Amino acid sequence: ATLKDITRRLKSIKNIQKITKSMKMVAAAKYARAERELKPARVYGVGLIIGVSSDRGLCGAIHSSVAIIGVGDKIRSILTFKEVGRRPPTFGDASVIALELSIIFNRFRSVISYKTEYSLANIIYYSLKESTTSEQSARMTAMDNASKNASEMIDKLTLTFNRTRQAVITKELIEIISGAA
Amino acid sequence: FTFASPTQVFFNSANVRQVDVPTQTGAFGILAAHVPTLQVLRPGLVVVHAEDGTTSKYFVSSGSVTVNADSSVQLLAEEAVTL
C-alpha cells in the first residue's frame, strides 16, 4: 500500500517483462536457425514408445501435448535422455540415443499451428530437428503472451501508484494546515 | 538421385547419368537402369557423373544407398566433405 512497496513491485514486474520480451526475440532468432536447418533435414530422413522434447521449459503446451526411453528431461517429469534444447540437436546426439537401445514428436507447420540399422537413427534425427523447431516457435508465443500479461500488470499498478501518490500529498498537506490552525 | 548429409544437400532428385558408390562389398556404379536393392556404405569416394558429361567428386564415411522399384536413388551419408 505504501509508495515504497509499489515502487519495488513495479521494478520487480518490469524486470520480468523485460526478460520475457528478451526471450521472445531469442526464440524468434533460434527458430530462424532451426527452420534454416530443417530443410536439409526433411530431405534426409524419410526411409516402442519414444517421446521427444527438451530440458528447457517456458514453451507453452509442448511438453504437456506429448502423452529406458524418453528424450527430454521434461517428459520423465510426469511419471532416460537428458541435456537437450540448450544447444541445437546434432546427428551425434541422435546416434547416442540409437546406441543405448512408434515415435511421438511435434511436427513444425508454421509459427502458430502444430500437430502431435542406420535408418532407425535417421528417424530419431528427424524427430530431434522437428522438435526443436516446434519448441522454439511455441516459446516465442509463450513469452509473447507472458510479456503481455506482465504489461497489463504494470498498467494496473501504475494506476495504484498514482492514487497513492495523490493520497500522500493530501495527507502531508492536512497535517500542515491542522498544525497551523 | 538424392545425395544428402545431415549438414547439407548435394543433389535433390536427379536427373543424372551414373553414380559411383562405396559399399561394404567393394564398390557399385549405379546406372539409370539398375536393379532394386538396399545397400550400406563404407569409407570411400563418391563419383557423380553429370548428365552433361562432367564429373563431381565427394567423399563418404558411412551411410546407406537406396534404389527403389522405379528409376530413383537416394544416397545419404553421415558426413560428406570436399576435399
Partner: peptide, 23 residues
Amino acid sequence: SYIRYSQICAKAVRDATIKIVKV
C-alpha cells in the same frame, strides 16, 4: 551394430550434448 561403426568413420572424416541417465 552399424551405428557404432558409422560414428567411428565419422570421427576420422572430421579430422580433414546429450548425457546418459539410467535409473
